[PDB]
Design a protein around this motif. Structure first.
Motif, mmCIF file in Angstrom:
data_model
loop_
_atom_site.group_PDB
_atom_site.id
_atom_site.type_symbol
_atom_site.label_atom_id
_atom_site.label_comp_id
_atom_site.label_asym_id
_atom_site.label_seq_id
_atom_site.Cartn_x
_atom_site.Cartn_y
_atom_site.Cartn_z
ATOM 1 N N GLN C 27 0.678 -1.026 0.292
ATOM 2 C CA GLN C 27 0.129 0.114 0.248
ATOM 3 C C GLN C 27 1.473 1.227 -0.356
ATOM 4 O O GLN C 27 2.111 1.531 1.078
ATOM 5 N N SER C 28 0.099 2.039 -0.647
ATOM 6 C CA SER C 28 1.039 3.392 -1.003
ATOM 7 C C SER C 28 0.081 4.808 -1.015
ATOM 8 O O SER C 28 -1.166 4.554 -1.006
ATOM 9 N N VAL C 29 0.630 6.217 -0.935
ATOM 10 C CA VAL C 29 -0.274 6.988 -0.374
ATOM 11 C C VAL C 29 0.368 7.542 -2.348
ATOM 12 O O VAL C 29 -0.261 9.065 -2.737
ATOM 13 N N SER C 30 1.080 7.662 -2.982
ATOM 14 C CA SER C 30 1.615 8.030 -4.230
ATOM 15 C C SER C 30 1.609 6.948 -5.061
ATOM 16 O O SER C 30 2.412 6.947 -6.245
ATOM 17 N N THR C 31 0.943 5.708 -5.116
ATOM 18 C CA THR C 31 1.598 4.678 -6.293
ATOM 19 C C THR C 31 -0.062 3.804 -5.859
ATOM 20 O O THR C 31 -0.946 3.981 -5.263
ATOM 21 N N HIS C 32 0.096 3.118 -6.967
ATOM 22 C CA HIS C 32 -1.438 1.567 -6.733
ATOM 23 C C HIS C 32 -0.398 0.445 -5.447
ATOM 24 O O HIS C 32 0.430 0.978 -5.556
ATOM 25 N N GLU C 78 -8.520 -3.873 6.622
ATOM 26 C CA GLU C 78 -9.825 -4.500 5.424
ATOM 27 C C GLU C 78 -9.020 -3.310 4.207
ATOM 28 O O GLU C 78 -8.914 -2.311 4.027
ATOM 29 N N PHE C 79 -9.310 -3.819 3.004
ATOM 30 C CA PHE C 79 -8.581 -4.181 2.218
ATOM 31 C C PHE C 79 -9.759 -5.136 0.511
ATOM 32 O O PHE C 79 -9.891 -5.615 0.734
ATOM 33 N N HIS C 80 -10.680 -4.129 0.064
ATOM 34 C CA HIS C 80 -10.965 -4.048 -0.526
ATOM 35 C C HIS C 80 -10.170 -3.914 -2.235
ATOM 36 O O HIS C 80 -9.467 -2.631 -2.685
ATOM 37 N N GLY C 81 -10.438 -4.776 -3.255
ATOM 38 C CA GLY C 81 -9.242 -5.030 -4.549
ATOM 39 C C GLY C 81 -10.272 -5.861 -5.332
ATOM 40 O O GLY C 81 -11.048 -5.865 -5.347
ATOM 41 N N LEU C 82 -9.569 -5.515 -6.899
ATOM 42 C CA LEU C 82 -10.150 -6.601 -7.966
ATOM 43 C C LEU C 82 -8.535 -7.204 -8.436
ATOM 44 O O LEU C 82 -7.624 -6.942 -8.631
ATOM 45 N N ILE C 83 -9.107 -8.491 -9.359
ATOM 46 C CA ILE C 83 -8.501 -9.084 -10.021
ATOM 47 C C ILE C 83 -8.061 -9.001 -11.444
ATOM 48 O O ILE C 83 -9.043 -8.155 -12.240
ATOM 49 N N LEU C 100 -3.118 -15.402 -8.198
ATOM 50 C CA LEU C 100 -4.413 -14.489 -8.308
ATOM 51 C C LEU C 100 -3.217 -13.086 -8.339
ATOM 52 O O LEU C 100 -3.028 -13.011 -7.163
ATOM 53 N N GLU C 101 -3.457 -12.586 -9.038
ATOM 54 C CA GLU C 101 -2.779 -10.492 -8.727
ATOM 55 C C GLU C 101 -3.614 -9.727 -8.825
ATOM 56 O O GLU C 101 -4.859 -9.866 -10.351
ATOM 57 N N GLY C 102 -3.708 -8.781 -8.748
ATOM 58 C CA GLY C 102 -4.304 -7.318 -8.663
ATOM 59 C C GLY C 102 -3.899 -6.516 -7.562
ATOM 60 O O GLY C 102 -2.788 -6.105 -7.733
ATOM 61 N N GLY C 103 -5.538 -5.499 -7.669
ATOM 62 C CA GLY C 103 -4.756 -4.021 -6.422
ATOM 63 C C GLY C 103 -5.817 -3.269 -6.538
ATOM 64 O O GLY C 103 -7.191 -4.005 -6.776
ATOM 65 N N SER C 104 -5.831 -2.186 -5.977
ATOM 66 C CA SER C 104 -7.064 -1.223 -6.206
ATOM 67 C C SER C 104 -7.300 -0.942 -7.323
ATOM 68 O O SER C 104 -6.594 -1.285 -8.078
ATOM 69 N N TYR C 177 -5.763 5.717 -2.586
ATOM 70 C CA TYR C 177 -6.682 4.540 -2.010
ATOM 71 C C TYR C 177 -6.606 5.032 -0.389
ATOM 72 O O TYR C 177 -5.589 4.348 -0.317
ATOM 73 N N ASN C 178 -7.518 5.049 0.094
ATOM 74 C CA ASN C 178 -7.577 4.739 1.732
ATOM 75 C C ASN C 178 -7.322 3.152 1.721
ATOM 76 O O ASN C 178 -8.166 2.672 2.998
ATOM 77 N N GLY C 179 -8.006 2.681 0.995
ATOM 78 C CA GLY C 179 -8.075 0.730 0.678
ATOM 79 C C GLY C 179 -10.173 0.127 1.105
ATOM 80 O O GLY C 179 -9.785 -0.680 0.518
ATOM 81 N N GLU C 180 -10.926 1.362 1.202
ATOM 82 C CA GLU C 180 -12.584 1.505 0.805
ATOM 83 C C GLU C 180 -12.595 2.583 -0.081
ATOM 84 O O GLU C 180 -13.685 2.037 -0.797
ATOM 85 N N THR C 181 -12.470 3.564 -0.278
ATOM 86 C CA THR C 181 -12.898 4.262 -0.710
ATOM 87 C C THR C 181 -11.330 5.718 -1.683
ATOM 88 O O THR C 181 -10.294 5.436 -1.129
ATOM 89 N N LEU C 182 -12.295 6.294 -2.828
ATOM 90 C CA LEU C 182 -10.889 7.159 -3.633
ATOM 91 C C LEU C 182 -10.693 8.475 -2.863
ATOM 92 O O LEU C 182 -11.743 8.995 -2.826
ATOM 93 N N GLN C 183 -9.883 9.008 -2.161
ATOM 94 C CA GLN C 183 -9.982 10.110 -2.109
ATOM 95 C C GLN C 183 -9.133 11.540 -2.891
ATOM 96 O O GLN C 183 -7.994 10.222 -2.837
ATOM 97 N N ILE C 184 -10.168 12.327 -2.945
ATOM 98 C CA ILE C 184 -9.265 13.719 -3.520
ATOM 99 C C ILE C 184 -9.341 14.830 -2.326
ATOM 100 O O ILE C 184 -10.338 15.507 -2.295
#
Lengths: 103, 127, 204, 126, 101, 127, 51, 50, 126
Positions: C27-32, C78-83, C100-104, C177-184
């Motif tokens: 997890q990062s604050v400036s990357t996927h 908690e973390f939610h993502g996609l494959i 299985l590989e994926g991310g936010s 992305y904070n784990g469940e929402t995209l923050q701007i």
């Protein structure tokens, strides 16, 4: 003193003041940083952590080590089933996050 | 001829073997480069119909204390090794139909304080 | 139940529990954010050849949830993502395994170079336009600090994420992305925890 | 004087050896750093014309259970029981020059093992 | 009598002798010279927590001297440089160590 | 008494020792995570004036079969271990002029099918 | 729909049809691929294998 | 009988057979082909320095 | 019964064991691929009041020479000699049980070793 041009157009005097501030805080934030590791999942991304060294260590008077904001973290579970993590941080008063991967 | 007794969880056991060791890291030029570590007691006792060492390892996770007393002459206690704030980290039980002692139990204790005679080893666990 | 590790991790794929061997999450604050999960097939269940690789290849783009719980303190993550990738492989005649590989969801926003332009909008309106023509289901908090109007912005053969990542950061805005929402924008988060050397910190 | 009897697969065998063990991890200051793992049972048996333990191993998709009874001197002292286990190692050795003409040693991996009021259980995600 | 090595290396930081465990030094005619030194903190002495990381960080920009001597021939090699950044490490209750770059 | 005789390549040999094994891989939590693999037979026999095990390893590259029969001396047959579709993978010959066994042969067989009593082990060797 | 310009000059309608067709097949062929190991020397570059 | 590996590889340099230790070869449809060979010099023959 | 004696630094010592070996490297097909290397000598000696072997390892840093003579009947059978050598290992052991308590074991790495009509020479360029 070293002078450079702006990388995006600015249309007022306050525009360049805000552009300059973001650049200054990104550079000052890299003067000192931390990198630690643990086995505790209460460490969360984008939050604050206060670090210290216990007083039971020999000869320690000043205990504070810093207040940091978490900018990355990696979680692992190995084939035996054990959890661990590592993380990095910048000082906790910084208002501008790193540049990252932008091009 | 020696004797040794272990007083653990309110019971008495008969000891066949005992050992403990301490260590300290050494630089390539011979100087010590760390402080004392270690302090683990390995015990080899007889087995019977009671299962109370295994209960403390599995059915309970709390620190415990214990004591070993060495007797010389077939009275006159020789030494006494004490531990406090410890956990059992290994366990083994063997039976051999042919050959010497039939049923034995081996286990290792990892504790914070170790006292023997007038010497004391204490580990700094920052709590 | 006794005999529990300090931290317990639970993985669910499309709502059903996964049987894994190894995980990894970054997890990062400036990357996927990225995850990589290894799944095993047991000897008494069908193998990856009895099922068929193309029937496994039809769970691309599904949801993944990872939840980590600390039993002593009762704290969770908690973390939610996609494959986005799947690997099926085997060696020496075994039953095989799946990776299985994926991310936010922002990883699926980074696969489409194009050309656009925006005339006399603000950052609030430009963000909504990019996310409106996306096709990826996501929830967002849209609260930038610069509320004025920009006369001209151009998207020059870049993807949706690459265009948005560049533009928002040059204005000094938080964008992650904070784990469940995209923050701007700045979330104004002041939540503190204490950590000590040799007390729940194994190295500094 | 000592005897051990293994009751397994509706038969009785004479046991020569038996063993089981458990372990944890420590972190160079003595503080435990993991949970308990292990729990395998190793047995040694004299083989007499009956190839029935081997047939149980070849039945790869069926768990079983068993008991071992210890008798001291000229009455039961302990009993070790397992349930929901598999045989995961088998060896049969024959030596003619030396003693022990025919013997079998094998290992059992079980979900639960119990001995005299203590028990150890693993979690199996099914 | 003394069991001296073939080559002896001495390091001085701000004019005082350094106690190191490992060294690396790289030189070229087309790039920067770079060194990396690991410093020893003995159990008798104060540790890196008794001193304090912010007091160790006062060594940025100081002078470093490295001398190499070959005993059987009398040859010598000299290098003078400056410190650019400092790391302070420690793991599992250890007293810590310092790496100078 | 106890004796065992090996029938192979149309000849009979006197066995002094024999063994075979099977195994499965086990997950960190004790659950099996593989199928059975193994079935290699290690044999120790007395070498008598002729070389026929050696030329089946060297001068032949076809699968073969063999049997070992175990009997309790005074002749009673109780067990027979057979193999089919096998190769010889190790071979060694030892001579020591001290005593006991002065001239012996040890070899290992790897086969697809192993039979003992009422149990069998078959491997997957596709085409 | 995402649009991009050509990386190469085109001089008729048939040229751009061929240019776009090559770009499509290169992107489509990366949807699924194989990787394998062997000890057989009859697998050769540019040939077809049935698995 | 003679024991042979399943696959036999022969390397010739300017028409003469080469005695090698290891060998590597990489082929592509959209790049260069590359090889790497390690040649063996025996104690009963002239050395690299001679 | 054998008598072995060691002449070193103008003194005589009673030998208990002795060894020396040589080796070559071999290809995967069994063909030699290197030259002969080795030639270290391992010696076991009975300790006494004198400490001359220790002062040769520490207090001096010059090459030395020495010889060992083996007698079977009482007569001289073989002689092993070295020149241009160094002592690279040293060990003194005491054990109060019996069977030669005070002993010394050391290793010599020389350039030339000779026994009977056989010679081994190393290339040490100067």
């Amino acid at each position: 003193e070293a002078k450079l041009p702006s990388i995006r157009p600015a249309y007022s005097a306050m525009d360049l003041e805000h552009y300059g501030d973001a650049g200054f805080h990104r550079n000052y934030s890299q003067l000192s940083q931390i990198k630690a590791s643990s086995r505790y999942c209460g460490i969360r991304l984008g939050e604050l952590v206060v670090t210290r060294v216990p007083e039971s260590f020999p000869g320690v008077k000043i205990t504070d080590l810093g207040r940091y904001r978490i900018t990355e973290i990696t979680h692992t579970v190995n084939y035996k089933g054990q959890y661990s993590n590592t993380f990095c941080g910048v000082p906790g008063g910084t208002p501008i996050m790193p540049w990252g991967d932008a091009v | 001829a020696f004797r040794a007794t272990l007083s653990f969880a309110g019971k008495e056991f008969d000891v066949l073997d005992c050992t403990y060791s301490l260590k300290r890291d050494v630089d390539s030029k011979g100087r010590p480069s760390s402080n004392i570590y270690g302090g683990q007691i390995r015990l080899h006792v007889e087995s019977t119909d009671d299962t109370s060492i295994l209960e403390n390892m599995t059915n309970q996770f709390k620190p415990h204390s214990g004591s070993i007393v060495f007797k010389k002459g077939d009275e006159a206690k020789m030494k006494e090794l004490t531990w406090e704030n410890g956990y059992i980290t290994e366990f083994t039980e063997n039976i051999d139909i042919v050959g010497s002692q039939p049923m034995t139990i081996t286990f290792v204790v990892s504790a914070q304080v170790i006292k023997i005679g007038g010497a004391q080893f204490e580990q700094n666990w920052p709590k | 139940s006794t005999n529990l590790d300090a931290v317990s991790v639970e993985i669910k794929v499309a709502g059903k529990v996964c049987d894994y061997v190894t995980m990894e999450l970054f997890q990062s604050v400036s990357t996927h954010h990225r995850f990589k999960i290894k799944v095993n097939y047991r000897p008494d269940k069908p193998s990856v050849w009895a099922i068929g690789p193309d029937v496994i290849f039809k769970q691309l783009g599904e949801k993944v949830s990872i939840i980590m719980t600390h039993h002593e303190s009762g704290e969770k993550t908690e973390f939610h993502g996609l494959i986005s990738d799947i690997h099926v492989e085997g060696f020496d005649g075994n039953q095989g395994f799946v990776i299985l590989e994926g991310g936010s969801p922002t990883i699926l926003l980074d696969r489409d170079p194009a050309m656009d332009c925006y005339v006399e909008q603000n950052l609030n309106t430009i963000v909504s336009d990019i996310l409106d023509k996306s096709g990826v289901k996501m929830n967002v908090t849209n609260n930038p600090k610069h509320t004025d109007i920009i006369p001209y912005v151009a998207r020059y053969k870049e993807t949706s994420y690459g265009f948005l990542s560049r533009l928002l950061r040059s204005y000094g805005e938080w964008f992650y992305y904070n784990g469940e929402t995209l923050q701007i924008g700045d979330p104004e988060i002041d939540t503190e925890s204490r950590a000590g050397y040799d007390v729940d910190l194994t190295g500094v």
